[PDB]
Amino acid sequence: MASLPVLQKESVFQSGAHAYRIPALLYLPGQQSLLAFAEQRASKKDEHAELIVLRRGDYDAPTHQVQWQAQEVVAQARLDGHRSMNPCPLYDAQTGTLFLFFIAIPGQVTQQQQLQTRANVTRLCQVTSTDHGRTWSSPRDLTDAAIGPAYREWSTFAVGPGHCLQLNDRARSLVVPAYAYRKLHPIQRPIPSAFCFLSHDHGRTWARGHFVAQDTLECQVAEVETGEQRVVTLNARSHLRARVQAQSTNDGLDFQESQLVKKLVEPPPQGCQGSVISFPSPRSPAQWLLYTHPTHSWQRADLGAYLNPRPPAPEAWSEPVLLAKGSCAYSDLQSMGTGPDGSPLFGCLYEANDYEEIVFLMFTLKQAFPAEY
């Protein structure tokens, strides 16, 4: 009946003078440290978002616990006159550059407004750091160079939220998951579709991948090595009572085999954000997928961990394991290497209790799916 016993469970953000939503977790392997980001908002409402805050947590091997340093605002992560949303972190292991992608929206202009008027005013931005978050560069607006001509074709858009992906292709490409509302019919209202932004030069230039032929929203991507190639699995939010899963054989440019995965429930009326990561298989496939998302048929509750030992086969998704009882919403996963018990170690940030705190969970595969051992 109880939720899963884990290595650590600590609230790293709490409502106070500000509210905190939309978690993003990024693991730094060389430091054995985590960077937890979140939207520091004036209230729980989406349009009250303001700045992005951060906390550095250092894993202590002797105690197998993470001690977090004090939170601080990423002062540089903002455009004058705009509120910052959707933190999407990414570390470039080759350049030693830490990236924080996010969107900036004028004052409190809502998503609803952009949708009803078919008028886009959202900006795509970023900030970088060479000392693991100690200091940040000035912000940079990537809208023109990354969206350009397509801007007028979308009512609005967003990235992530959550960790991004750096591929294992020769260029070590940066992949930023996203979605946009497409103006397709003169009368019918624009339909949203997932897609990815792509950079093959360590963040110098960007491009837009193609859309998932389905009414899809927020998504995340993970890279899996099959017996023949590297594939990018995309897991997206949907309003059809089930998640939509698609696959790409060309590093994010095209997604196919789009379909509903009835085993992964989505609550009404439009679903909820979820997270997906790949990690070293304990054993044919080299990597397995772990996914976290609410498991309730009618509301956002009971965060579950799902395992796919035969990725990306839709019917291979396991039944969920209960990670947290009650109100649970957005989440973000990170693989942290080998844990204290020899099995894959995981870090997970998730919204809990009617959006009043963001909890950090650390557990292993042995703890979550013991039947595997």
Ligand SMILES: CC(=O)N[C@H]1[C@H]([C@H](O)[C@H](O)CO)OC(C(=O)O)=C[C@@H]1O
């Ligand atoms: C940019 C933005 O407002 N994102 C919001 C997102 C969005 O409304 C949905 O993906 C449909 O577009 O939904 C939710 C949500 O808890 O359901 C919170 C996000 O802050």
